Amino acid sequence: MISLIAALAVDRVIGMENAMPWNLPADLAWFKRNTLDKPVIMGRHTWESIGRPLPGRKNIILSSQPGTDDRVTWVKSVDEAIAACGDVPEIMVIGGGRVYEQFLPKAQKLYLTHIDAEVEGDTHFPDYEPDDWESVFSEFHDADAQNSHSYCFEILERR
Template identity: 40%
Template sequence: MSSLSIIVATDSKLGIGIDNKLPWHLPEDLAHFKRTTTGHAIIMGRKTFESIGRPLPNRRNIVVTRNHEWQHAGVEVVASLDAARALLDQELAFIIGGAEIYSQSMELANELVVTEIQQEFACDAFFPVINPLIWKETGREKHFSKEKNLHFAFVTYKKI
C-alpha cells in the first residue's frame, strides 16, 4: 500500500483559498511545495487542477472528478479518492487539494505537511481542523518572508 500525505498551506483560520485561487502569493511556500512533491504522485480534485491549469512537471498527476467526460493530457483521471489510491503501488503520494478532497483524505493520510501562515485572509475554502488526538506535531520550521512581511512555518504532523 502506498504512503499518503497531505500537503497544504493555510492561513491562521485554516483558510486555503478563495474563488478557486490562493489568497496569498508566498514564493517560499511554492518552493517548499515543489521540493516536497517533485518525483512523487500528486492527487487533486478537478477544480484544483483547473486552478493550476496544467499538469505539474516531474510528478504523476492524478485528478479526481465525478465528471466521467472530463480529461486532460498529462493526467490520470479517476472518479474517487479510492480509485486514485488503487492506481498507486508503493509510491508516496501527496493530496494537494481542494477542500473536499482534503476532507475525504484526512482519515486515509498518515502525514500532514502544513504551511501555517500567521495571518488571516479572505477565504471561502477551508482545511479541516487538525485534531490533536489523532495528529501529533513532529516538526516545525519557523520562517519570515521579508518580501511579503509574513510569518509562516512548515509544520509536519504524523498520525498517532
Template identity: 40%
Template sequence: MTQLTIIVATDAKGGIGIDNTLPWRLPEDLAHFKRTTSGHPIIMGRKTYESIGRPLPNRRNIVVTRNADWRAEGVEAVPSLEAARALVQGGAEAFIIGGAQVYRQALPLADTVIRTEIAKSFECDAFFPELPAGEWQETARESHVSEAGLPYAFVTLRRVAR
C-alpha cells in the first residue's frame, strides 16, 4: 500500500493560506519542501496546482479535481484522492501538498504529517484540520529562526498504531 505523507506549513492558528497564496515568506520552508518531496509523487487539489502555476520538477504531479475536462501539461488529473492513490501503488511514498479540502480527505489515510509550524499568526482563509487527540505522536522537531527573524519548526508526527 502506498504510504501517504502530508506535508504542510501552518501559522500559529493552523492557517495555511489566503486567496490561494501563502501569507508568509519563508524560503527555508520552501527549500525543506523541495528536499523532502523531490523524487516522489505529489498529490494536490486543482486550486493548489493553479496557485503554483506549473508542474513541480522532479516529481510526479497528480491533481485531484471534480472537473473531468480539466487538463494541464505535465500533470495527471484524477477525480478523487482514491484514484490518485491508485496511480502510485507499489509502496512508493506519496506526498499530499494541499489544499485544505485535500488535507481533510487525506488525514484519515495518512501515516505521517510533516508540518512546518510558524510561530506567528497571519491573515488566513484556509486552515489545516486539527489532528485528533491521541492519534498522532510527535517523533521529531527541529526549531529554527529564519533570516528574517521568524521562528519556525519542522515537526514530524506519526500516526499511533491503528
C-alpha cells in the first residue's frame, strides 16, 4: 500500500522557495522512524531541497528528465515509481506538492504532522476530503527547548 507523510504548517503550507523554513527535530525523528527501511518516492524539487540521499531507504526520484546521480533511482511516471519499489508492504511518498497531489488518490494512509506555526509559503498539501479518512493515532506535544512550536502527530487511514 501507498502512504503519504508530510509536515503541514497553518493553512496546509509545506514549503517556501524550495525549503522548509522551520526546525523541529522531534518531527524529523518521527519522519525517520516511519520511513526507515522503506522505499521513499519524491519529486525532483524535493530531492534538490534535501540535497543528498536518505540513508537506509531506497530513494526513488520522479523526473521527466534523465537522472543526474546514480546513488538514487530515477523514474519517469507514477506507475514506474511504484514498480521500482518492488513488492514491499508499504511505500512512503515524501512529497512535494505536485507529487502528493498525484499519489493521494492511491494512498491508504496519511502520516501528518500539524505544526502550530504561520509560514508564508508557496507550496500546499492537497486539499483532502475529510470524510474519506479516519484518525487512528493522534499525539500532541507542546513546544520545548528543542522544538519551538507545538505539533500534533496524526495517522489517518482511508475509510
